[PDB]
Paper text:
The RING-between-RING (RBR) E3 ubiquitin ligase family in humans comprises 14 members and is defined by a two-step catalytic mechanism in which ubiquitin is first transferred from an E2 ubiquitin-conjugating enzyme to the RBR active site and then to the substrate. However, RBRs do not induce the essential closed E2-Ub conformation, but instead stabilise an open E2-Ub conjugate conformation and align the active site cysteine in their RING2 domain with the E2-Ub thioester for Ub transfer from the E2 to the RBR E3 in a transthiolation reaction. In a subsequent step, Ub is transferred from the RBR RING2 active site to the substrate in an aminolysis reaction, analogous to the mechanism of the structurally distinct HECT E3 ligases. We focus on the first catalytic step, i.e., Ub transfer from the E2 to the E3 (transthiolation), and present crystal structures of both RBRs captured in E2-Ub conjugate loaded transthiolation complexes with an additional allosteric Ub.
HOIL-1 shows poor E2-Ub discharge activity in the absence of an allosteric activator or with 5 µM of most di-Ub species, but its activity is strongly enhanced in the presence of M1- or K63-linked di-Ub. In the absence of allosteric Ub, we observe no stable binding of the UbcH7(C86K)-Ub conjugate to the HOIL-1 helix-RBR module. However, the UbcH7(C86K)-Ub conjugate binds tightly when HOIL-1 is preincubated with the allosteric activator M1 di-Ub (KD = 0.2–0.5 µM, n = 2), whereas preincubation with K48 di-Ub, which does not activate HOIL-1 in the E2-Ub discharge assay, enhances E2-Ub binding to a lesser extent (KD = 5.3 µM). We copurified the HOIL-1(C460A)/UbcH7(C86K)-Ub/M1-linked di-Ub complex for crystallisation via size-exclusion chromatography. The HOIL-1 structure contains two near identical complexes (Cα RMSD 0.396 Å) in the crystallographic asymmetric unit. Both complexes consist of the HOIL-1 RBR and the UbcH7-Ub conjugate but show clear electron density for only an additional mono-Ub, rather than the M1-linked di-Ub. Unlike canonical RING domains and all other RBRs, HOIL-1 features an extended loop between the seventh and eight zinc coordinating residues (RING1 Zn2+-loop II) that consists of eight residues in HOIL-1, but only 2-4 residues in all other RBRs and two residues in canonical RING domains. The comparison of the HOIL-1 RING1/E2 sub-complex with the structure of an active RNF4-RING E2-Ub complex shows that the extended loop would prevent formation of the closed E2-Ub conjugate by clashing with Ub in that conformation, therefore blocking Ub discharge from the E2 via the classic RING mechanism and forcing reaction via transthiolation. HOIL-1 I358 is central to the allosteric Ub binding site and, accordingly, the HOIL-1 I358R mutant is less strongly activated by M1-linked di-Ub (EC50 = 24 µM) compared to WT HOIL-1 (2 µM).
Numbering used by the authors:
A (entry chain C): 2 to 153
B (entry chain E): 1 to 76
C (entry chain A): 257 to 510
D (entry chain G): 1 to 75
The structure:
């Protein structure tokens, strides 16, 4: 069941495109593991891409998949271990109708505008809530230093 | 052979297994009798966490032995 | 004419599964379905297929199977009716769905005693002066004082027999010492409601017990909320109240 | 409307009720069909303990729904 849907999802993903999710490394061996490249649009992340790995469970789509960031980012919702707390794919908010592209665009929207109400780094969340300027500067520096390069 | 599995507070399960049954199979039998998915299960017998891949005979689990179930919950 | 058009909806209340009149796509598996091959939920009028609804009930640990529909804009909050759930599951799968709701309510209550007979599904509620419970499933006299079934012997004898039986049970003492070490070192904790032993794997600083649905604050090692559940700040760690975190190390426990 | 009442023993009863019927009324029907006093009765639907005073419509209990009967022993 999981192989049947995931097969059809990638077919349409490569049919249209996303312009914000490039390098769709999907090995046909293990269909339960995708590798992609998030390209944000708004600052302080407009100067770099981020490698991510999405792991789909065996009970997909009846259970949520989970995304881990390969490229480390100075973000209040993403810890330095790579985890991201996305409400769309939480075990309590997950709905089998949620499509993979919706998850990708929700994560991209979380990156473009962080939300310090459900953070993984409380200090970065407080800094984002209070001093937006210094947080944006530090995030731009981190994206330039440790971030990837945007594919064109 | 029959063994005991203490799960919920006060509930005791009895599983029909064999010494060649792997830990993954035993966790699956618990799911059929409790609905707890194996990824949320970790079994402890005589002070040792049973690792996946191994069998019940590897831990010297004999008949009428009592395993203990603890839940590994994922944070968010 | 409209008196018969509005009359056709009492007709749908007869059968449990309201099937689809016009063909529709199931938004979970992408399978074209003919009239009579798709199922439409009643509390949201969303159309799904045979298996996808069956899989949603299987991989759901909530006592109320929610509708699995979400799109670009909103998230459906409809529920599956038991008549629809029963007519979708086998008698074995349906009985497992009924036992899930009973288990959640039993462990949510702080006055629930289960039968000590292995594999038995019988339990009850107790007060504070009740001393015995004749199980209605296996007809075994559960003793409530020492919390175990001991027939043809008194409590003083059962306590003595349990001591002798445990005096040389090295495997029992080992797993007990492991649990004691796991709680002291903070590797695991007992769920503050149903008292089951739980451990946090990855994530932030909060977990939801899959046995009684109690939200647990991992850092403070206790209930996240009060007796009222999520939102109740009369108890629990009261995190984020007035901006103060519940513990200096806490970063997110809802 | 008709609903089901499952007792842990395995027995399932069918009660003719209405959404306006209170939980006390349902317990009274259970007493009339089983002899179990209402003070020793506890009804459970979808993992929630049904409180007296409220109605079946308050808990979204529709027809052919299955409640569960557990015994409250008095000391
Ligand atoms: Zn489907
Ligand atoms: Zn719906
Ligand atoms: Zn019993
Ligand atoms: Zn006793
Ligand atoms: Zn619990
Ligand atoms: Zn807390
Ligand atoms: Zn907190």
């Amino acid at each position: 069941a999981a192989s049947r849907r995931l097969m059809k999802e990638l077919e349409e993903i490569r049919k249209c495109g996303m312009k914000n999710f490039r390098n769709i490394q999907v090995d046909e061996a293990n269909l339960l593991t995708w590798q992609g490249l998030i390209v944000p649009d708004n600052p302080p992340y407009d100067k770099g891409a981020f490698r991510i790995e999405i792991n789909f469970p065996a009970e997909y789509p009846f259970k949520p998949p989970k995304i881990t960031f390969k490229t480390k980012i100075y973000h209040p919702n993403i810890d330095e271990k790579g985890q991201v707390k996305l409400p769309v794919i939480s075990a309590e908010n997950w709905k089998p109708a949620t499509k993979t592209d919706q998850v990708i665009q929700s994560l991209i929207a979380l990156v473009n505008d962080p939300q310090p109400e459900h953070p993984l780094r409380a200090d970065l969340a407080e800094e984002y809530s209070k001093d937006r300027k210094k947080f944006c500067k530090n995030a731009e520096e981190f994206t330039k230093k440790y971030g990837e390069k945007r594919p064109v | 052979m029959q063994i005991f599995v203490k799960t919920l507070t006060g509930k005791t399960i009895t599983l029909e297994v064999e010494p060649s049954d792997t830990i993954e199979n035993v966790k699956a039998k618990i799911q059929d009798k409790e609905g707890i998915p194996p990824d949320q299960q970790r079994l402890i017998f005589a002070g040792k966490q049973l690792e996946d891949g191994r069998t019940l005979s590897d831990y010297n689990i004999q008949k009428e032995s009592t395993l203990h179930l603890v839940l590994r919950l994922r944070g968010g | 004419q409209q008196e018969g058009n509005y009359l056709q909806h009492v007709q749908l209340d007869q059968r449990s599964l309201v099937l689809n009149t016009e063909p529709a796509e199931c938004p979970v598996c992408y399978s074209v379905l003919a009239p009579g091959e798709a199922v439409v939920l009643r509390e949201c009028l969303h159309t799904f297929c045979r298996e996808c609804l069956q899989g949603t009930i299987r991989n759901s640990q909530e006592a109320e199977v929610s509708c699995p529909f979400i799109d670009n804009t909103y998230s459906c909050s409809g529920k599956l009716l038991e008549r629809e759930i029963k007519a979708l599951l086998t008698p074995e799968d349906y009985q497992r769905f009924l036992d899930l709701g009973i288990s959640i309510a039993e462990n949510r209550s702080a006055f629930s005693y289960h039968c000590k007979t292995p594999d038995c599904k019988g339990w009850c509620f107790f007060e504070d002066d009740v001393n015995e419970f004749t199980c209605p499933v296996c007809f075994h006299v559960n003793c409530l004082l020492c919390k175990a079934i001991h027939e043809q012997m008194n409590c003083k004898e059962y306590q003595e027999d349990l001591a002798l039986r445990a005096q040389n049970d090295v495997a029992a003492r080992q797993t007990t010492e492991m649990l004691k070490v796991m709680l002291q070192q903070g590797e695991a904790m007992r769920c503050p409601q149903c008292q089951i032993v739980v451990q946090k794997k990855d994530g932030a600083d909060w977990i939801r017990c899959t046995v009684c649905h109690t939200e647990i604050c991992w850092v403070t090692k206790g209930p996240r909320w009060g007796p009222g559940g999520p939102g109740d700040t009369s108890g629990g760690c009261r995190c984020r109240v007035n901006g103060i975190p519940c513990h200096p190390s806490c970063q997110n426990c809802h």
